[PDB]
Symmetry: C2
Subunit: 177 residues, 2 copies
């Protein structure tokens, strides 16, 4: 009766990523993959290095493992910004071809780094009622680790920062790290 256009599917995927928790198990990730990918889908990461092109292709089975992995090291947020996508409708598929795609991951402590991985993202959807990704190909061109700067001078005098210093010397020694 209706049909989701493909950019709404991606907003859905960002929204679903936002409800992941530190308690989300592997079954939650399996359902994430079942929601958005096809049963035979693949996910490819591509780099152009001095040695030549580097392909990393993940089968459908490990697509859930991949997303769980991106979250592993204290990550709290992951989302996708697609800038100026081009859609092309085919007989049985739609392709979303984004030249400026940014994958954003927010880290927690101690750095609270915002990581931006940017490149070309090619998405092949099925012209389906379900509208799931059949191929995900991400060619990485650019990478940034953004660190919050200390905005005010008095921040370097915060007694909580100095306590963190003193709490190291309490648990470890002064001659000890």
């Amino acid at each position: 009766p209706y049909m989701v256009q493909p950019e709404y599917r991606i907003y859905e995927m960002n929204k679903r990523l936002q409800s992941r928790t530190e308690d989300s198990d592997n079954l939650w990730w399996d359902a994430f993959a079942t929601e958005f990918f096809e049963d035979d889908a693949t996910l490819t990461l591509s780099f152009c290095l001095e040695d030549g092109p580097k392909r990393y292709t993940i089968g459908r089975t490990l697509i859930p493992r991949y997303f769980s992995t991106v979250f592993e090291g204290g990550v709290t947020d992951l989302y996708y910004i697609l800038k100026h996508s081009k859609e092309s409708y085919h007989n049985s598929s739609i392709t979303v071809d984004c030249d400026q795609c940014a994958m954003v991951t927010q880290h927690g402590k101690p750095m609270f780094t915002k990581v931006c991985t940017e490149g070309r993202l090619i998405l092949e959807f099925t012209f389906d009622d379900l509208m799931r990704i059949k191929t995900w190909h991400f060619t990485i061109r650019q990478y940034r680790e953004l660190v919050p700067r200390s905005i005010l001078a008095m921040h370097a005098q915060d007694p909580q920062v100095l306590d963190q210093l003193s709490k190291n010397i309490t648990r470890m020694g002064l001659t000890n790290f």
Copy 2:
């Protein structure tokens, strides 16, 4: 099954089509697309002296958004997290306690600025679904700088070139 939060995704997409040469007329069409003819926009702070509220009238709403692009900014988008949607007579409320306004700067710092807080949006329950009120309570602010990832970046001859250009501007 109507989905009001996506209206802001569309705003994000629409903002991306802004160019370095986007008119005042362009921003007036932007405002007309997403805001009612009588909308207001309010930013709020809780400060040492009490609530401070800044409210913009509809005619000043396009100039709000283009001002955000005046410092050499290249991107502006909104990230809404765990929004609660509410349906009234003729209105829908979108209340997001984790709204992030993200702006990308250009040279020399290439900063990414994240302004975060509570965003409340009142939409008309009609076919255009345009914003009646936009109320943003700013609770958190971060200026993120790209770090230098590799030690050899400090020896880059283009970095030394800009230094050399500087000393020329001295005598």
